[PDB]
Amino acid sequence: VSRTPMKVKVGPSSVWFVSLFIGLMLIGLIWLMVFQLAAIGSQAPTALNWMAQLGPWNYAIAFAFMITGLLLTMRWH
Amino acid sequence: VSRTPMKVKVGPSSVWFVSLFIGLMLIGLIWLMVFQLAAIGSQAPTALNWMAQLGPWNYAIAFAFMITGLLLTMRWH
């Protein structure tokens, strides 16, 4: 469909692309955290550690907002 | 552009919607990388600790591939 001046289809159109993009991101968040929370890592002058019992809170909320805010932008469009 | 059943127009479209998505994702990743790379943070049973001097890599590289991955899906669709 179109909200203006932008029209987006993979079709039946706007809902279906956006819904797929929303899922693919949410899945990427969960995986990236899961491996990260196992992970402790250093390469060159950069070093990164994540450790958990369970609750992947900081990155997942921030990225989920960022994608959802893009979704609100894509649908305003 | 259209590849199909998909057609995506913001108008003028093609390179422009896609360029804009690469740009905002890149900026988002840099913001997370600087603030976090100073950070050490614990909330609930989940704790994430990040240290920098030069470089941004693991987080950076996976995020950049995700930008690419959407780009390829769009090019294809």
Curated annotation (Swiss-Prot), chains A, B:
Alphabetic keyword roster: Cell cycle, Cell division, Cell membrane, Cell shape, Membrane, Transmembrane, Transmembrane helix
What is its subcellular localisation?
A: Cell membrane
Q: Name one GO cellular component term.
A: plasma membrane
Spell out which residues lie on the membrane's Cytoplasmic side: 75-77
Q: What are its GO biological-process terms?
A: cell division; regulation of cell shape
- Where would you find the membrane-spanning parts of this chain? 15-35, 54-74
- Bilayer disposition of the protein: Multi-pass membrane protein
Query: How does it associate, per the subunit comment?
Result: Interacts with multiple cell division proteins such as FtsZ, PbpB (PBP3, FtsI), FtsQ, PBPA and CwsA.
Q: What is this protein called?
A: Cell division protein CrgA
